[PDB]
Amino acid sequence: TNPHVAVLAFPFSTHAAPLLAVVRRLAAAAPHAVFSFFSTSQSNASIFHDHTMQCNIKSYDISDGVPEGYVFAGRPQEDIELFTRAAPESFRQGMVMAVAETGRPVSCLVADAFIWFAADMAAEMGVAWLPFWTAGPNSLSTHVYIDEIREKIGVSGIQGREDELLNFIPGMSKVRFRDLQEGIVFGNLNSLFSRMLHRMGQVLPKATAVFINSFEELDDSLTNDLKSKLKTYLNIGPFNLITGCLQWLKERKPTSVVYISFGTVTTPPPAEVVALSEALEASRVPFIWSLRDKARVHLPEGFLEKTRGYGMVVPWAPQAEVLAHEAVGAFVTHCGWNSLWESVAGGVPLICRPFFGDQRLNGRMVEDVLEIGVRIEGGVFTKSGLMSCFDQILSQEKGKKLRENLRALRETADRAVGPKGSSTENFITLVDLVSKPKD
Ligand SMILES: O=c1ccn([C@@H]2O[C@H](COP(=O)(O)OP(=O)(O)O[C@H]3O[C@H](CO)[C@@H](O)[C@H](O)[C@H]3F)[C@@H](O)[C@H]2O)c(=O)[nH]1
Ligand SMILES: O=c1c(O)c(-c2ccc(O)cc2)oc2cc(O)cc(O)c12
């Protein structure tokens, strides 16, 4: 038969949405192929919200892995653990349904890199395995190098060595030991999530091709190194350059507003919430703060009332549109990959407060490599540190330089995704791979 591409999403944080975005581009490029998109019912409901969807894509709801009478212990990553333990069976049962509906065997397996066992499912089915790394090439590299990093550094702690450099890994000359993701050489190395990512790192070199929402020219040496470690390595982004709040912003002066958000699975600790509120109020800087409604309990009494004239606190913002708005002059961020590229699209300097995963590597890239943002003194929010960052960016020479660097970076990125761009050519390659029928 003609192709039937099974797509296996990771249904937590911002993973399923970028994967659907690529699938949409692939379905338009390969109109003869059918695509079956597997995630949980909650994930699909969110990302498929709303007549524009390519007719050759259909979503399928798979199990969240939670047993019927289950009582949560309240561990962190408990939902992830439940989903992950059931996922091999959950995805298999989804694909069975899609094969019966379409009458076409699965010819290709696209999956979030996190679904490491997708490699084994693909080998069993006799089809290509095409993992999507949803974050940056920095974190991809450290994952692919996990064994070597562990061998060089050891796994009994990095006490006294936090600021030592990872300069023995290509493209990582400015990354310190402390910048590494949890599960590499520190954190709970025996957790299910740590073991998952360890195996992923090992099996990624076996993929038909690994693809990523970045552009090759972000770092030539890193790109070259990854092409040496992987069978085929395809930069196909940035996606965002390819494809109440706004009314309020209309009346603000250019480059005057601070936007604040910490992604989809973080809130700063309550003391840091207080600290930001104090900095906003003391500077009287116009602001839009994306803050979980549940977390509003942590705002100092009177904060909302004193800032009503110049700031909004909302449970969800149209973030990409806010960052592209001329009134916005800075972005206080956890340094998640998707947020970073939206800020680059908008030409808005970052104020970085990374928490976990790849965010410290991304913060290092932003501050020391690309120079498109600044660090917060001590890596935690304080009233004085934040006030200094706002001044540096909105009112001082530093902000002009960061804006200049952002312009140049965005132009390079634009050319990667234009006609004859490196990401354009790489995407053709990926289309060719997903278009192949089964052996
Ligand atoms: O009020 C809001 C708030 C957010 N959004 C949108 O949600 C997305 C957040 O993506 P981002 O990658 O920055 O953060 P997060 O989901 O925590 O990332 C995880 O996944 C990332 C990629 O895998 C990884 O880099 C990171 O470390 C992880 F935490 C981004 O597209 C925002 O525009 C919004 O529209 N409105
Ligand atoms: O979604 C998540 C995610 O992507 C990452 C991550 C881990 C290593 C990386 O290199 C990059 C990202 O960690 C997480 C940790 C959580 O407790 C919950 C999550 O949802 C994520």
Side-chain angles (χ1 to χ4, degrees), residues 14 134 264 290 316-317 319 334 336-339 342 356 358-359:
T14 305
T134 80
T264 57
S290 171
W316 192 251
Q319 174 171 304
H334 73 321
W337 190 250
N338 301 99
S339 286
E342 300 166 356
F356 70 83
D358 66 333
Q359 293 155 23

Side-chain angles (χ1 to χ4, degrees), residues 10 12-13 15 77 80 114 133 135 139 143 181 193 197 265 356-358:
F10 181 74
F12 301 100
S13 81
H15 279 255
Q77 312 178 333
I80 285 164
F114 275 10
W133 183 257
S139 56
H143 281 295
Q181 312 97 298
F193 197 56
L197 262 22
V265 291
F356 70 83
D358 66 333

Side-chain angles (χ1 to χ4, degrees), residues 142-154 166 168-170 184-185 198 229:
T142 64
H143 281 295
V144 163
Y145 275 104
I146 183 164
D147 291 325
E148 181 167 340
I149 295 171
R150 284 188 175 179
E151 285 170 31
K152 267 77 154 175
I153 293 173
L166 231 241
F168 56 88
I169 310 275
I184 307 290
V185 292
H198 181 210
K229 290 273 276 171

Side-chain angles (χ1 to χ4, degrees), residues 53 104 137 180 213 236 292 331 340 349 351 354 373 430 432 438:
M53 188 58 53
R104 292 191 177 181
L180 290 169
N213 181 15
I236 59 154
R292 295 242 205 171
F331 180 16
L340 182 167
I351 302 164
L430 180 65
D432 285 352
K438 192 175 158 168

Side-chain angles (χ1 to χ4, degrees), residues 244-245 248 252 257-262 267-268 273 276-278 280-281 285-300 302-318:
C245 288
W248 185 92
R252 299 327 194 263
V257 178
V258 181
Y259 176 68
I260 305 110
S261 184
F262 303 103
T267 277
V273 166
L276 177 55
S277 72
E278 284 184 355
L280 293 170
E281 185 183 338
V285 65
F287 69 85
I288 294 173
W289 189 351
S290 171
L291 180 68
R292 295 242 205 171
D293 269 349
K294 291 288 179 176
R296 296 171 70 104
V297 304
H298 304 301
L299 298 162
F303 172 76
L304 291 172
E305 300 104 294
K306 284 178 281 170
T307 62
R308 196 165 39 213
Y310 56 96
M312 296 173 67
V313 183
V314 307
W316 192 251

